[PDB]
A paper describes a structure:
Across all domains of life, a widespread class of OB folds have specialized to recognize and manipulate tRNAs, perform key functions in [name] trafficking and metabolism, and are designated as the [name] binding domain (TRBD) superfamily (IPR002547; PF01588). In bacteria, [name] [name] ([name]-binding protein, 111 amino acids) and Escherichia coli Trbp exemplify the free-standing, dimeric OB-fold proteins that bind diverse [name] species. Trbp has been suggested to facilitate the folding of the [name] structure by binding its characteristic elbow region formed by the intercalation of the D-loop into the T-loop and was observed to enhance aminoacylation by several aminoacyl-[name] synthetases (aaRSs). Contrary to previous proposals, [name] does not recognize the global [name] structure nor its elbow or anticodon but solely binds its universal 3′ terminal single-stranded CA dinucleotide with a strong positional, structural, and sequence preference.
As described, [name] forms a homodimer where each protomer adopts a canonical OB-fold architecture resembling the Greek key motif, in which five β-strands assemble into two three-stranded β-sheets which are joined to form a β-barrel. The core OB-fold comprises residues 16–89, with the flanking N-terminal (1–15) and C-terminal (90–111) residues of each protomer interacting in an antiparallel manner, forming a central interfacial region. The interface involves an extensive network of hydrogen bonds, salt bridges, hydrophobic interactions, aromatic stacking, and cation-π interactions, altogether burying ~ 1955 Å2 of solvent-accessible surfaces. These contacts produce an unusually robust dimer interface (theoretical ΔG ~ − 22.5 kcal/mol, Kd ~ 3.1 × 10−17 M) that resists denaturation by heat, SDS, Urea, or guanidine treatments. Full denaturation was only achieved when combining heat denaturation and 6 M guanidine treatment. This compact, ultra-stable protein-protein interface is consistent with the hyperthermophilic nature of [name], which grows at 85–95 °C. Its resistance to heat and chemical insults is in line with proposed functions as chaperones that may aid the folding of other proteins (e.g., CsaA) or tRNAs (e.g., Trbp). Our [name] apo structure superposes very well with the complex (RMSD ~ 0.6 Å), with key side chains occupying nearly identical positions. Therefore, [name] is pre-organized to capture the terminal CA dinucleotide of tRNAs.
Residue numbers in the entry:
A (entry chain B), B (entry chain A): -1 to 111
The structure:
C-alpha cells in the first residue's frame, strides 16, 4: 500500500533499484499542466527525460545545474505526450517537498546501489 | 550481481523499500575496526542504530547534526557486536564517497517512498 507501513526487506529488494546521481541540464514547464515539470538529466554517458509533479514546489531556477538522486531503472511511460523514463527522489514531511542531492560534489552517474 | 546492469523494475519494487530522512544524533568509532562508524539516527518519532563503512571518507564531525537519507526497513544484523538495523544511502564514482541529504530542510522522518 502507498500509505501503508513497509515491512522489513532484504538487501536484494534494495539492489533491484538503480539509484543514481544525475545533473539537471534543464527543467521546463509542461504544456497544458500546472503541476508538471519536464527535466532533462545527464547521467554522465547518457541523458534521461523525467516528468515530475513538483512544479508548485520547485522553480526551474532552483533545479537547473544541481545534482539530484533518481531511480534510473523505472519502466518508461507516456506522461502528457512526453516519454519519461525514471523518476526523481523526493522527500516530504507533509508540509514541504525536497529533491535529494549528494552531500559532496560527486560526479554525474555515481551509483548508489 | 552487484557489478551487473540492473534490469528495469516496476514502481512496486521501489515502494517496497522505505527511504527516509534521518538526523544524525551521534557518530562514534567501532572498536577493532578502522573502517566502521556506529551512527544513531532520529526519524522524528523513533531512532535507529546503523553501522557504516565510511570512516575512511567521513569523520564524526562532518556527520553529526546532518539530515541524511537512509533505508529504514532493512533487516537487522549484528555487525561487530552492534545491532544495526537500517542502511545509509551512499553515492560513489570510483573516486569519492558521499552521503545523501535533502536539498531543502525537511523534518526528520520525512518519507521518500
Amino acid at each position: 500500500g502507498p500509505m501503508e507501513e513497509k515491512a522489513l526487506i532484504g538487501i536484494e529488494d534494495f539492489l533491484k533499484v538503480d539509484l543514481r546521481v544525475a545533473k539537471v541540464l534543464s527543467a521546463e514547464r509542461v504544456e497544458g499542466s500546472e503541476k508538471l515539470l519536464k527535466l532533462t538529466l545527464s547521467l554522465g554517458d547518457e541523458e534521461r527525460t523525467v516528468v515530475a509533479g513538483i512544479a508548485k514546489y520547485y522553480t526551474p531556477e532552483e533545479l537547473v545545474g544541481k545534482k539530484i538522486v533518481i531511480v534510473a531503472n523505472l519502466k518508461p511511460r507516456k506522461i502528457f505526450g512526453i516519454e519519461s523514463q525514471g523518476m526523481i527522489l523526493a522527500a516530504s514531511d507533509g508540509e514541504n517537498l525536497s529533491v535529494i542531492v549528494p552531500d559532496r560534489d560527486v560526479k554525474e552517474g555515481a551509483k548508489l546501489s
